[PDB]
Amino acid sequence: PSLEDLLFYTIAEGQEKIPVHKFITALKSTGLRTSDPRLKECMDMLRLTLQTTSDGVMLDKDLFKKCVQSNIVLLTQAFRRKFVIPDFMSFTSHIDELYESAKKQSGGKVADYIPQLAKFSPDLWGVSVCTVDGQRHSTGDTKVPFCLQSCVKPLKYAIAVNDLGTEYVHRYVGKEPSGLRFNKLFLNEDDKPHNPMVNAGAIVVTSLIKQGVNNAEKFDYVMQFLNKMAGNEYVGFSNATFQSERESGDRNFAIGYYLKEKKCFPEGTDMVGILDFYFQLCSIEVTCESASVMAATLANGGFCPITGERVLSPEAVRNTLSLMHSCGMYDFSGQFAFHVGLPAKSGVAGGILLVVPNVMGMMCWSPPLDKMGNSVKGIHFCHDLVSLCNFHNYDNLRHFAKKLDPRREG
């Protein structure tokens, strides 16, 4: 009694033959996209079958077997409800409601210190989800590209820890929040930036990645790596944002000279070059969708959930998630950790990279920022989400009052 034929009877309902669209609809209903890279062989085979059998279109036990066999393990887990969120449909309806609520939150100011962010409508609002099992949902403007900006800080920190290890990286950068009123100070008392999520800390992390090669390869190396975290969905680049960011980055240069003088960099660092590399990494583009997959890779201990590819070490991902928890939301970091209790990173373009460990990754995007620099609708959404679901780090998985748990059912 193979997997293939016993799953066959599940969708077969008791009939001899299965509608192709009935299979596809059932597949989608689990939250998997038909374009999922782990489902390619099966999708090619279904397409091929539609060609070679216009006499249909319905799958015999043996025909069904011939399509789904190469992707059979995934298809089972999907259809035997063993995914991290069993009732993904119900969950996405909740996501949509959360979305509609934050959509009514119209305040905040779009960043305008360079013309490439002043341009973005205040009304763009997008939310994407990717579970650690690759289940997907999106609502709103989730295919509009925007710059990562500071959302890239944890990503490049993760690359650094991955390539070099914790101990080395943290010779150069600390692992703690500054404390909300040592905002302005570049260095902690050990003459290290206090953590990798502040600009000074990010600038030093940037200086550690791929030492020795030029910025072109350095950038290519980081771009490859983001491609994998995103399961090869959209990772772009804004040159316009880069040119603007470098021509108006006085404080970043102020930080650059300070760090150099305090000898914060590895020997042989070309600081002005590192600053230029730093502006490039800030100008790297995503959509909500592709970024949600990056977040999911961090939710999934370093494996990209839609390719099954190991992208980062567990050590790299844990460190990163630790610091997004405590340092990722600027001056709202403590507030956020307290009330939302999720690892997250915001950016000046309006992105909030969000991780729900062992469940899912998200990217919420809306350009208007609050006084602290976080997307208004993103922050509102994040609070609501943890109000609804027992996703708070220190929520309990067995005793959680009236909170809903999307990891269960009846």
Ligand X SMILES: O=C(Cc1ccccc1)Nc1nnc(N[C@@H]2CCN(c3nnc(NC(=O)Cc4ccccc4)s3)C2)s1
Nearer to ligand X, 158 or 255 (CB): 255
> Contacting a second copy (CB under 8 A), which of 76, 211, 215, 387?
387
Question: Which tokens sit at 289?
Answer: 């969708």
401: partner contacted, choices a second copy, ligand X, none (Cβ within 5-8 A by kind):
a second copy
Segments of 74-200 assigned E as strands: 109-110, 126-131, 136-140, 146-147
205 carries a ligand binding annotation:
no
Distance in angstroms (rounded) separating the CA atoms of residues 209 and 156: 8
The site partner of 314 among ligand X, a second copy, none (C-beta below 5 to 8 Å per kind) is a second copy
Closest CA to 176 of 188, 185, 163: 188
Q: Which does 186 bind (CB under 5 to 8 A by kind): a second copy, ligand X, none?
A: ligand X
Name which of 59 and 98 has its Cβ closer to a second copy.
98
366 binds, among ligand X, a second copy, none (CB under 5 to 8 A by kind): none
Could you give the CA distance from residue 34 to residue 96 in angstroms, rounded to a whole number? 21
317 binds a second copy (CB under 8 A): yes
How far lies 258's CA from each of 155, 186, 243, in Å?
24, 8, 23
> Which partner, ligand X, a second copy, none, binds residue 227 by CB below 5 to 8 Å per kind?
none
Q: Is 35 in the site for a second copy (CB under 8 A)?
A: no
Non-local (6+) Cβ contacts of 271 within 8 A are: 207, 256, 257, 259, 260, 265
Please state the closest distance from residue 371 (CB atom) to ligand X, in A.
14
* Number of residues this chain uses to bind a second copy (CB under 8 A): 64
Number of helices (H), then strands (E), in the chain: 18, 12
Report the distance separating Cα 283 and Cα 12, nearest Å.
50
Count of beta carbons in the 10 Å neighbourhood of residue 296: 32
Residue 87 backbone phi and psi in degrees, to 5: -100, 80
Q: Residue 189 interacts with ligand X (CB under 6 A)?
A: yes
Interface with a second copy includes 328 (CB under 8 A)?
Answer: no
Closest Cα to residue 324, out of 173, 205, 168, 196?
196
With DSSP H G I counted as helix, E B as strand and the rest as coil, what are the percentages for the chain, rounded to 5? 50, 10, 40
Q: Which of 86, 231, 301, 373 binds a second copy (CB under 8 A)?
A: 301
Kindly tell me which of 57 and 388 has the beta carbon lying closer to a second copy.
388
d(CA 386, CA 263) in angstroms, rounded, equals 42
Q: Of 100 and 176, which CB lies nearer to ligand X in the complex structure?
A: 176
Q: Which is nearer to a second copy, 70 or 393 (CB)?
A: 393
Position of tokens 């290890």?
Answer: 165
Residues 6+ apart with CB under 8 A from 255: 186, 199, 200, 203
Span of 169-177, 202-210, 232-240, 283-291 interacting with a second copy by CB under 8 A:
169-177
Of residues 41, 176, 191, 247, which one binds a second copy by CB under 8 A?
176
> Closer to a second copy at the Cβ: 275 or 296?
296
Q: Residues 168-187: x/- map of binding to ligand X (CB under 6 A)?
A: -------------x--xxxx
199 is in an annotated binding site: yes
Residue 206 in contact with ligand X, rule: CB under 6 A: no
Q: Is 104 in the site for ligand X (CB under 6 A)?
A: no
Which of 106, 224, 239, 248 contacts a second copy by CB under 8 A? 106
188 forms part of the interface with ligand X (CB under 6 A): yes
Helix (H, G, I), strand (E, B) or coil at 130: strand
Residue with smaller CB distance to ligand X, 184 or 371: 184
Q: How far apart are CA 360 and CA 354, in angstroms?
A: 9
User: Does residue 300 interact with a second copy by CB under 8 A?
Assistant: yes
Q: What, of a second copy, ligand X, none, does residue 61 touch, CB below 5 to 8 Å by kind?
A: none
**Contacting positions for ligand X (CB under 6 A):** 181, 184-189
Binding residues for substrate, by number, are 150, 199, 245, 252, 278, 330, 348
